[PDB]
Amino acid sequence: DQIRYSIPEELAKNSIVGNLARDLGLSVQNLPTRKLRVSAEKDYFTVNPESGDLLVGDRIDREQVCGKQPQCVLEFDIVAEKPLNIFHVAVILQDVNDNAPLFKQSEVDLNIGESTRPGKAFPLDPALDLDAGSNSLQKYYLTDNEYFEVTEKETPDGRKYPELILKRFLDREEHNFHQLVLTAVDGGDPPRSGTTQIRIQVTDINDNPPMFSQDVFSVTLREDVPPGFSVLQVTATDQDEGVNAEITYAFHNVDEQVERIFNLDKRTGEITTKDNLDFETAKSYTLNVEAKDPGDLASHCSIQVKILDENDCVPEVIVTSVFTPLPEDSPLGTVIALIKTRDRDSGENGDVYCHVLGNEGFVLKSSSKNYYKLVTDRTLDREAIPEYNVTIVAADRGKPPLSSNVIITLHISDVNDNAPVFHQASYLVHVAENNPPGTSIAQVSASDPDLGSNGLISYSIIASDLEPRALSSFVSVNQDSGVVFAQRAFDHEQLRSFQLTLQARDHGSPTLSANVSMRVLVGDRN
Amino acid sequence: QIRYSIPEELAKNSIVGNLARDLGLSVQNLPTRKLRVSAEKDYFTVNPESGDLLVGDRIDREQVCGKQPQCVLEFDIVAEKPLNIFHVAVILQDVNDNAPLFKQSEVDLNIGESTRPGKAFPLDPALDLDAGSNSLQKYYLTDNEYFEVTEKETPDGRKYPELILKRFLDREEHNFHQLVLTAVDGGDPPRSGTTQIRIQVTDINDNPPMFSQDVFSVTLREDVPPGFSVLQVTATDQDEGVNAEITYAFHNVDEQVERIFNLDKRTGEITTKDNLDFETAKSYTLNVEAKDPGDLASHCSIQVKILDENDCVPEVIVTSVFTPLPEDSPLGTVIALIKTRDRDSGENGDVYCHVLGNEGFVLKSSSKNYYKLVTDRTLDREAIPEYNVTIVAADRGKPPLSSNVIITLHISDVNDNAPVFHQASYLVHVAENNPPGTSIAQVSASDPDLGSNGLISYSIIASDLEPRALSSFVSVNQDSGVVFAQRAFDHEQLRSFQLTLQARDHGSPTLSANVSMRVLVGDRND
Ligand SMILES: *[C@@H]1O[C@H](CO[C@@H]2O[C@@H](C)[C@@H](O)[C@@H](O)[C@@H]2O)[C@@H](O[C@@H]2O[C@H](CO)[C@@H](O[C@@H]3O[C@H](CO)[C@@H](O)[C@H](O)[C@@H]3O)[C@H](O)[C@H]2NC(C)=O)[C@H](O)[C@H]1NC(C)=O
Ligand SMILES: *[C@@H]1O[C@H](CO)[C@@H](O)[C@H](O)[C@H]1NC(C)=O
Ligand SMILES: *[C@@H]1O[C@H](CO)[C@@H](O)[C@H](O)[C@H]1NC(C)=O
Ligand SMILES: *[C@@H]1O[C@H](CO)[C@@H](O)[C@H](O)[C@H]1NC(C)=O
Ligand SMILES: *[C@H]1O[C@H](CO)[C@@H](O)[C@H](O)[C@@H]1O
Ligand SMILES: *[C@H]1O[C@H](CO)[C@@H](O)[C@H](O)[C@@H]1O
Ligand SMILES: *[C@H]1O[C@H](CO)[C@@H](O)[C@H](O)[C@@H]1O
Ligand SMILES: *[C@H]1O[C@H](CO)[C@@H](O)[C@H](O)[C@@H]1O
Ligand SMILES: *[C@H]1O[C@H](CO)[C@@H](O)[C@H](O)[C@@H]1O
Ligand SMILES: *[C@H]1O[C@H](CO)[C@@H](O)[C@H](O)[C@@H]1O
Ligand SMILES: *[C@H]1O[C@H](CO)[C@@H](O)[C@H](O)[C@@H]1O
Ligand SMILES: *[C@H]1O[C@H](CO)[C@@H](O)[C@H](O)[C@@H]1O
Ligand SMILES: *[C@H]1O[C@H](CO)[C@@H](O)[C@H](O)[C@@H]1O
Ligand SMILES: *[C@H]1O[C@H](CO)[C@@H](O)[C@H](O)[C@@H]1O
Ligand SMILES: *[C@H]1O[C@H](CO)[C@@H](O)[C@H](O)[C@@H]1O
Ligand SMILES: [Ca+2]
Ligand SMILES: [Ca+2]
Ligand SMILES: [Ca+2]
Ligand SMILES: [Ca+2]
Ligand SMILES: [Ca+2]
Ligand SMILES: [Ca+2]
Ligand SMILES: [Ca+2]
Ligand SMILES: [Ca+2]
Ligand SMILES: [Ca+2]
Ligand SMILES: [Ca+2]
Ligand SMILES: [Ca+2]
Ligand SMILES: [Ca+2]
Ligand SMILES: [Ca+2]
Ligand SMILES: [Ca+2]
Ligand SMILES: [Ca+2]
Ligand SMILES: [Ca+2]
Ligand SMILES: [Ca+2]
Ligand SMILES: [Ca+2]
Ligand SMILES: [Ca+2]
Ligand SMILES: [Ca+2]
Ligand SMILES: [Ca+2]
Ligand SMILES: [Ca+2]
Ligand SMILES: [Ca+2]
Ligand SMILES: [Ca+2]
Ligand SMILES: [Ca+2]
Ligand SMILES: [Ca+2]
Secondary structure, three states, rough: OOEEEEEEEEOOOOOEEHHHHHHHHOOOHHHHHOOEEEOOOOOOEEEEEOOEEEEOOOOOOOOOOOOOOOOOEEEEEEEEOOOOOEEEEEEEEEOOOOOOOOOOEEEEEEEEOOOOOOOOOEEEOOOOOOOOEEEHHEEEEEEEOOEEEEEEEEOOOEEEEEEEEEEEOOOOOOOEEEEEEEEEEEOOOOOOEEEEEEEEEEEOOOOOEEEEEEEEEEEEEOOOOOOOOEEOOEEOOOOOOOHOOOOOOEEOOOOOHHHHHHEEEOOOOEEEEEEOOOOOOOOOEEEEEEOOOOOOOOOEEEEEEEEOOOOOOOOOEEEEEEEEEEEEOOOOOOEEEEEEOOOOHHHHHHHEEEEEOOOOOOOEEEEEEEEEEEEEEOOOOOOOEEEEEEEEEEEEEOOOOOEEEEEEEEEEEOOOOOOOOEEEOOOOEEEOOOOOOOEEEEOOOEEEEOHHHHHHOOOEEEEEEOHHHHHHHHHHHHOOOEEEEEEEOOOOOOEEEEEEEEEEOOOOOOOEEEEEEEEEEEOOOO | EEEEEEOOOOOOEEEEEEEHHOOOOOOOOOOOOEEEOOOOOOEEEEEOOEEEEEOOOOHHHHHHHOOOEEEEEEEEOOOOOOOOEEEEEEEEEEEOOOOOOOOOOOOEEEEEOOOOOOEEEEEOOEEOOHHHHOOEEEEEEEOOOOOEEEEEEEEOEEEEEEEEEOOOOOOOOOOOOEEEEEEEOOOOOOOEEEEEEEEEOOOOOOOEEEOOOOOOEEEEOOOOOOOEEEEOOOOEEOOOOHOOOOEEEOOOOOOOHHHHHEOOOOOOOOEEEOOOOOOOOOOOEEEEEOOOOOEEEEEEEEEEEEOOOOOOOOEEEEEEOOOEEEEEOOOOOOEEEEEEOOOOOOOHEEEEEOOOOOEEEEEEEEEEHHHEEEOOOOOOOOOOEEEEEEEEEEEOOOOOOOOEEEEEEEEEEEOOOOOEEEEOEEEEEEEEOOOOOEEEEOOOOOOOOHHHHHHHEEEEEEOOOOOOOOHOOOEEEEOOOEEEEEOOOOOOOOOOEEEEEEEEOOOOOEEEEEEEEEEEEEEOOO
């Protein structure tokens, strides 16, 4: 059972709310009789007795009293004495738009993932406008931009708050961060705004792979670089940050020897040899390097290594045929030996010239490159020079040159080209009469410089002035020793001297001979 | 040089050609000149009797020539006595006997989930040791929606097969792929070589954590201790590894939510770290955010409601009391004004009052929660001057709680009792010739009132004697009530006289009582 009065809030103190003396039917003289008083938990109002009307007391701030409540009603009692009575009074106060909507924080900073799907919603803390009705918050709206949208969400249960609807994919390598201005507006005359700034810092995720500076590189090396030689350092650039920017390098899809010879450090990306190179084994290597982050995004490159040749192989002289023993009557230009040269190098380091040392009558003639023949230049002789030590030298054209020599041993075989020569130009022997038959009266001798059969000497009597049927009856000759024998006792009174033609013969093809004349003189006795 | 041409992989003793007829030699002299072959390897052997060239060891063209399109073998023939050398070259024509072949039958690649389309992946090529059209000519691949196959030629001329990607991968849809790569040459019949490529997609942090449902509902009784298991919340990330470990935390919350509740960052489990009260806050809106290391997050809210428990005792307040209370107070007169306050809500905060005992006071409720203590009995201070009215209030919750107060009432006196004489009439005998100024009688009266209202003062208002001589006969002491004789009495003159006294109270207004007194003058002899 109450009466109701209406005023605006924040009203001036001691402003009349209304006269209760008229509404409660109390004479102005009947009233001071009565203690008129206000009973309330917090004294927002008081009454002057002599006045008989209601008076505003303390600060009547609606927002600290009713809060959000749609209608604001202050219930309090009024006490009167003689007779004792309690009257009930409640006042309605109208809302004043004296509070503007304001966000809790001046700046809010969000971390939004780079790969957040579009349309995803991010709830935002709502502003606080303590007024009620139309004077409360009505419209959120955000900075016009292309990346983000704002909408006011109200769940069917009751609570409401604004949220960000993402418009498109983010990309920290395009924009590291954005800053936007959100405005909250209430709906009365005149509207009151409150702004806040949102800074969104995009966080890195893995979407860019390491990339090499070029598709292909090139380096060259001498084939004598020691193990550990820095060949080439490769690097890749990853546009991400954090662990999604760590780069690992590795050999992949390389021949076995390519991986065995070289060595690539995973973290640094530098390539150094681990063993000796050899141009004769591999003229060049090709290299493929894989660079990848932990997210297995990769890019690959190819480095081509071209080795350069060095003069490190000695030329070799191969001799494939030789003429031994060599007959001394061999004509000019006969081919004695077959010569080839092999140098595993390349270019001028493998180009070889061949010479024969000395001038003993042997020269090299070249039919074609690396092919030679060792011919005779002058006539030969075994009794002069029986044996030859022929040195052939091959030399390359590298700087400095590398040489090699070989020694061929030629033996000269005997040809029957020397006739036997008698020790004396003629022979003359003195045999005394009445000599014993079958004794040594003389001994011819010859000499032959040839070897073996071509130097074996046989002696024979070819002619004499005596009766041919009686020659053997007089003297004879030993074919093996040359000693001459008498086969009958000589008689001076019958014949004093006789003539003999002795012959020296060898055993060759053909046989060579020589004639000597021996005269036998028979001494005289009785 | 003599040029020939034969197919590879011919059987031994096969005739290549008759060099006796081709060199220009004579078959009569072929036995004397050893015809022989000098060469690096014993691929061939001539017969000196027949003078022809036989194949020796197997001549595998791919074991000699390799990459060279046309392959020639150059070897020498030595003669002897006469001694010469002859140059021959045999062309090895290619027989398609080698098929394309891969180093590994199965290759395993790791491709990140976010390789942009068109990214080329260079694969290990196939080896076709043949040359010409019989060498490798094209690559083919299983028809799928994700990968195409190409063959790229570096300007150097090295050819390699690279894969091209046409559609974004997704391991949450297809963890890995199995493909078939074939290599085809250009002979008839064409020989093919296959390999199986198992491509494995690597996890990339592309999916955010997500909750079962956006809003949860729980209720808590307000008397739960600190540390009560409120709720456990979990989220599921569709990724793997470090990309799928979750961190939960509060997000845009009131200070009180952070002071009362403790949420495990690792478990998503909320408990309370303080005591709750229903009268302070009836509900709590919690906002939880679950985020992965990539700052991808989803948000849910837990709307907690609080249950009221009866813990506030009801309070009785006596706004005003009416004491002292006049004993002439009519019925239904208001004594004390009462109000009731219980901070609980519902039946726990619904208070009702009643008076203990029965002594003439009843509680009439003008409105809900307000009482007037009125009288239903006429009071009398001479009977009961003090009252100790005990008022009790209780609530209708389970279990209920009550409280009492003791009002003390003092009863004000009112002059509501006139004095009464202890006797109805007075008859007094006086002897004759009594001394003037002697006590003849004494009257008495009583008044139960308090103080001046109970003070009695006597007087003689009237008598039958002439009023001028009344002062000469009798008198009364107003304090003691004694009736004295003011003269000597003579029986022969007057035998008896009557009298009319009054007993009066002193409080205003005065209450009086009249009494009659008869005086008989006794008779002596004079
Ligand atoms: C109305 O009630 C009052 C107060 O009663 C108080 O509360 C009750 C629940 C009981 O527990 C009472 O014992 C308690 O005092 C009564 O007044 C009280 O009366 C008693 C007895 O007459 C007084 O006791 C005296 O106390 C003093 C010391 O203060 C001693 O020296 C005395 O020897 C004697 O023990 C008590 O003081 C008094 N209290 C007050 C505040 O006056 C009252 O009698 C009662 N009236 C009726 C009609 O019931
Ligand atoms: C040839 O050389 C060998 C080896 O030293 C030697 O024994 C021989 O006497 C030499 N002959 C000539 C003729 O120089
Ligand atoms: C030696 O004598 C024989 C026989 O009379 C003769 O044929 C020859 O010419 C002579 N001279 C030589 C040198 O042999
Ligand atoms: C007592 O008597 C006097 C005179 O006779 C009279 O006026 C008075 O009213 C009487 N008392 C009462 C209580 O009536
Ligand atoms: C917000 O916007 C209002 C108009 O809607 C302005 O009046 C105010 O100053 C604030 O900028
Ligand atoms: C909201 O935003 C504006 C800038 O748009 C500030 O000037 C203002 O103080 C509040 O931070
Ligand atoms: C190793 O070191 C050499 C210099 O010594 C560099 O030229 C090379 O690129 C690699 O870094
Ligand atoms: C090159 O030098 C060597 C010695 O180092 C000789 O043996 C060779 O004959 C040529 O002169
Ligand atoms: C035999 O003996 C004689 C000596 O009487 C020599 O003169 C002769 O030459 C042969 O030796
Ligand atoms: C590879 O492909 C060829 C046809 O190009 C077939 O002949 C062979 O059997 C293999 O399938
Ligand atoms: C290549 O593919 C074939 C089937 O097409 C297999 O049989 C072979 O072993 C290789 O995996
Ligand atoms: C503690 O235990 C309760 C059940 O007793 C759960 O509901 C809560 O989520 C927490 O795990
Ligand atoms: C009021 O009533 C409650 C029970 O409702 C009691 O516990 C209390 O002592 C008082 O009598
Ligand atoms: C005065 O005294 C006499 C006795 O002396 C009493 O009889 C009389 O009633 C009054 O008290
Ligand atoms: C009359 O006198 C008696 C004593 O005799 C008192 O008790 C009474 O109150 C009245 O005054
Ligand atoms: Ca205000
Ligand atoms: Ca306001
Ligand atoms: Ca406002
Ligand atoms: Ca990016
Ligand atoms: Ca990366
Ligand atoms: Ca990135
Ligand atoms: Ca070398
Ligand atoms: Ca070399
Ligand atoms: Ca060399
Ligand atoms: Ca000679
Ligand atoms: Ca000779
Ligand atoms: Ca000779
Ligand atoms: Ca073959
Ligand atoms: Ca072949
Ligand atoms: Ca083939
Ligand atoms: Ca995915
Ligand atoms: Ca993923
Ligand atoms: Ca994830
Ligand atoms: Ca409580
Ligand atoms: Ca409670
Ligand atoms: Ca309660
Ligand atoms: Ca009374
Ligand atoms: Ca009284
Ligand atoms: Ca009285
Ligand atoms: Ca008398
Ligand atoms: Ca008398």
